[PDB]
Amino acid sequence: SLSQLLDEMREDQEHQGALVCLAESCLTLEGPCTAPPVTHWAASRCKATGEAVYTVPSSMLCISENDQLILSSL
């Protein structure tokens, strides 16, 4: 009947009431808000403090327009 209870009710507010609600389910408004999770790649990106990290100059990857025109042949 709670199935049918929802039908005979203002759609605006069941949509309204269920939205601000999962939203307050996600907030931590009680004191210190929690700490987000980290996956083992993210945790080791914060300690790659030594050398230059692996990154290619975008010159070497951006294929020229005039050599790409050649490349769609045969």
Partner 1 sequence: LSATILTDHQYLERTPLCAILKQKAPQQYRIRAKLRSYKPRRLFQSVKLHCPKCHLLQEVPHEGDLDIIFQDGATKTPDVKLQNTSLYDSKIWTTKNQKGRKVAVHFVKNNGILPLSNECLLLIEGGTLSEICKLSNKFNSVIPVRSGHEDLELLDLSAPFLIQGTIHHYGCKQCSSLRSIQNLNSLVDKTSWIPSSVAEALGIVPLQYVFVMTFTLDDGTGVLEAYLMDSDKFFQIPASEVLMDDDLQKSVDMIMDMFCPPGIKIDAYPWLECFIKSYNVTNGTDNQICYQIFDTTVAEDV
Give the total of residues touching partner 1 (CB under 8 A). 48
Give CA–CA dist 2/52, Å, rounded: 61
- What is the torsional sign of CA 31, 34, 48, 53? negative
What is the Cα 24 distance to its own chain's centre?
Answer: 19
53 part of the interface to partner 1, by CB under 8 A: yes
15 part of the interface to partner 1, by CB under 8 A: yes
> What is the DSSP-derived secondary structure letter of residue 46?
T
Nearest residue (CB) to partner 1, 2 versus 15: 15
| Binding residues for partner 1 (CB under 8 A) | 11-12, 15-16, 18-20, 22-42, 44-46, 48, 53-64, 67-68, 70-71
